[PDB]
A paper describes a structure:
Mpro, also named 3-chymotrypsin-like protease (3CLpro), is a viral-encoded cysteine protease that plays a fundamental role in viral replication. During the proteolytic process of pp1a and pp1ab, Mpro is indispensable and cleaves polyproteins at no less than 11 conserved sites. Domain I (residues 8–101) and domain II (residues 102–184) possess an antiparallel β-barrel structure and take on a chymotrypsin-like fold, harboring the catalytic pocket between them. Domain III (residues 201–303) is a globular domain composed of five antiparallel α-helixes unique to Mpro and is crucial for the dimerization of Mpro, which is a prerequisite for its catalytic activity.
Besides, SARS-CoV-2 VOCs carry mutations at varying frequencies in the Mpro that are specific to Alpha, Beta, Gamma, Lambda, and Omicron. where Alpha, Beta, and Gamma have the substitution K90R, Lambda has the substitution G15S, and Omicron has the substitution P132H. To elaborate on the impact of the G15S, K90R, and P132H mutations on the structure of Mpro, the apo-form structures of G15S, K90R, and P132H were determined at 1.77, 1.66, and 1.82 Å resolution, respectively. There is only one protomer in an asymmetric unit in each crystal structure, and all 1–301 residues could be traced in the electron density map. The mutant residues 15 and 90 are located in domain I and residue 132 is located in domain II. All these mutations are far away from the catalytic pocket; thus, it is reasonable to speculate that the G15S, K90R, and P132H mutations do not directly affect the architecture of the catalytic pocket. G15S, K90R, and P132H showed merely a slight difference from WT, with average root-mean-square deviation (RMSD) values of only 0.54 Å, 0.52 Å, and 0.58 Å, respectively, indicating that all these three mutations had a limited impact on the apo structure of Mpro. It is worth mentioning that the mutation of the amino acid at position 15 from glycine to serine did not cause any serious structural changes to the backbone, except that the substitute of serine formed an additional hydrogen bond with a surrounding water molecule. The catalytic efficiency (kcat/Km) values were determined to be 2.66 × 104 M−1s−1 for G15S, 3.05 × 104 M−1s−1 for K90R, 2.64 × 104 M−1s−1 for P132H, respectively, which are comparable to 2.71 × 104 M−1s−1 for WT. It is indicated that the G15S, K90R, P132H, and WT have similar enzymatic kinetic parameters and the impact of the three substitutions on Mpro could be neglected.
Residue numbers in the entry:
A (entry chain A), B (entry chain A): 1 to 300
Write the structure that this text describes.
C-alpha cells in the first residue's frame, strides 16, 4: 500500500549519458550504439541564438569541433548530421551498455521519468507529465540540456523527451528523440511562452481510484452522473473533456474497486464544486493529475 | 528552475539487488561483495510470525535452504549468520558491480531514495523521509521486503534502510542495514501501530526557501519573530521545535535569498494561523515537510 510519484529505475539510461562540448558550451548527450544525440543548439553562440540558421552554423563545424566524454574515456567523433532540432554525432565506439531501446513520441497526459544530468553525470530522477500545452513542469538548472525522459517496458527503454530550454514561467520545453519539438516552441530566442493549460481529467480519475485502493474513501458518494453532464462541469473548471475511450481505459480500476467510472465522476464533480473542506487525498490538498491509469495499476 | 521530489539515480543499487527464497517465501536481498543481506523473517512460516524465536528458527536451517538468484545466475550460499533483524548470507561470488558503499543510520527528518523491488527486480524509485515517529510513508506491495533506501554522495552509496513490514495505517517500518529497527517496531505479529507523528519544521522552512528561489513569494511578510515565540505557535500545530542548530543549517538558504530565518518563521506562523486562502506553493496546497535543507540546495 501507499502511493508515491515513482520514476523508473534509471540505471539503463545512466549508462548512456555523456558530456558534449562545442566551443564554450557544454551539455549532455545520449550515447546509443555508435551515435551520440544532443540538442543542436550546442553549436550556437549566445549571439547565434537571436536568429540562428542552423544549416549555416553546422556547415561551418568539423568533427573535431565536438568533444564527447563518456566518463573518463574520450569518444572520437567521426561524423555529424542534423535531424530536426537534435544533432547526431557518429563516434568510433558503440556504447557497450546500449540497452534495448525505442524512440517513441508521447501524448499530452502521459507520464515519463526524467534523468536530470549535468556535464554528462546523472544527478536525479523524477516523474513528469506532458502537459496539455506541451510543456513539462520539470526541475532543470543551467547545464541540464540534453537530459532525457523515458519509460521502461520489460527490458526496453522507450525514450520520449530530450530537454532543450526553460520558458519564462519556469516550465520546460524539449523534443522527442527525432528532434521534433513538443508544442509550438523553437530553439531560438523569442518571446515564446506557454499557452493556457488544462487539467488532465482521466488522470485525476485514475488517482481517485488509487486513493480508494489505498483506503481514502471520504469523497465517495452514492450518486452517478452522465458523461455529458460531467463534461459541462469539467469545462467550467478548465478540465479536459472525458471521452468514452477514457471511460474504457479506466475499466480495470473500476472493476477492482467496484466503483463505476460515472460514479467516480460524480465525486469529482462534487470536489470541484465544493473543494476538499480541509481534507486530503493520498497526502495532497489538491486534485493530482500527473498519474495515468497505467501509473496507478503499476503501483497499486 | 522548478522543484520536484527527486530521487538519486538508482543504477548503482539496481546492480546489487537479488532474489532470496527460503521455503515458500520469496523477497529481495542486497548483494555487496560476497554477502547478501535480507530480512531475517524470510525464514519464517506464517505460524512462526505469531511468536518467533529467530535463534531457534535459524539453527534449523542449512545453507542449501537459501536459494539466491542474481538475474539468471544462481548464487551458491556457503554460510549464513544473523545480525539483529537482517540475515547475512555468504555466497561464493563477490558482486562484480559492488559500488563504494557505507551503512549509515539516518535521523528522523532526513530523506533518502527507495528502490522498490519485486523478486529481485527493480520496479521504481522515489524519495522518502524518515518520519519523527520512525515510520516512512512508502509505496510497497507484497514481495517488496528487502528493498533498500539509500543516499549517494559523490560515488559512494550510503545505505540507510531496508524494508520489513507495513503497519496497519499503511505506513512502513524497517531497519538500518545492521538490522536494527527504526522505531519501536518488531519483526513479529503484534498489534504494533505507528505512534503520533509531528511535522518536520526545519524542512518546511527549507521548502519555503525553495519556493522563494523559484519565484513563489506571496507568503512573505516584513515581520520577524523570535525563536521562542515561533516555537509556541509550532507546538500548537504539532510542529517539531526549531533549534538554533536548525537556524544555522538554514544559513546558506537565508543568504542566497536575503530572507533571515526568523523572518521566514513569521511567514510560516501566518500560514499556520490562516492557511493558504486557496493559493499554492511550489505546486502544493499544503506545507511540505519531506525536503531537507540539503535537498533544496542540491536542487536549487
Amino acid at each position: 500500500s501507499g502511493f508515491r510519484k515513482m520514476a523508473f529505475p534509471s540505471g539503463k539510461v545512466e549508462s548512456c549519458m555523456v558530456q558534449v562540448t562545442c566551443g564554450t558550451t557544454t551539455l549532455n548527450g545520449l550515447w546509443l550504439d555508435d551515435v551520440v544525440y544532443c540538442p543542436r543548439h550546442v553549436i550556437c553562440t549566445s549571439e547565434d541564438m537571436l536568429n540562428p540558421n542552423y544549416e549555416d552554423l553546422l556547415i561551418r563545424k568539423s568533427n573535431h569541433n565536438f568533444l564527447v566524454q563518456a566518463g573518463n574515456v574520450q569518444l572520437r567523433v567521426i561524423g555529424h548530421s542534423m535531424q530536426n532540432c537534435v544533432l547526431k554525432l557518429k563516434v568510433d565506439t558503440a556504447n557497450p551498455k546500449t540497452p534495448k531501446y525505442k524512440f517513441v513520441r508521447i501524448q499530452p497526459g502521459q507520464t515519463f521519468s526524467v534523468l536530470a544530468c549535468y556535464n554528462g553525470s546523472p544527478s536525479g530522477v523524477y516523474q513528469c507529465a506532458m502537459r496539455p500545452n506541451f510543456t513539462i513542469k520539470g526541475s532543470f538548472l543551467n547545464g541540464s540540456c540534453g537530459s532525457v525522459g523515458f519509460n521502461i517496458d520489460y527490458d526496453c527503454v522507450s525514450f520520449c523527451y530530450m530537454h532543450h530550454m526553460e520558458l519564462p514561467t519556469g516550465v520546460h520545453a524539449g523534443t522527442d528523440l527525432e528532434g521534433n519539438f513538443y508544442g509550438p516552441f523553437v530553439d531560438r530566442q523569442t518571446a515564446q511562452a506557454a499557452g493556457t493549460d488544462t487539467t488532465i481529467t482521466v488522470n485525476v480519475l485514475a488517482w481517485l481510484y488509487a486513493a480508494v485502493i489505498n483506503g481514502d474513501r471520504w469523497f465517495l458518494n452514492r450518486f452517478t452522473t452522465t458523461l455529458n453532464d460531467f463534461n459541462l462541469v469539467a469545462m467550467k473548471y478548465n478540465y479536459e473533456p472525458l471521452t468514452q475511450d477514457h471511460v474504457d481505459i479506466l475499466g480495470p480500476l473500476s472493476a477492482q474497486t467496484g466503483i463505476a467510472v460515472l460514479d467516480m465522476c460524480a465525486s469529482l464533480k462534487e470536489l470541484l464544486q465544493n473543494g476538499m473542506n480541509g481534507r486530503t487525498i493520498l497526502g495532497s490538498a489538491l486534485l493530482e493529475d500527473e498519474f495515468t491509469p497505467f501509473d496507478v495499476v503499476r503501483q497499486c
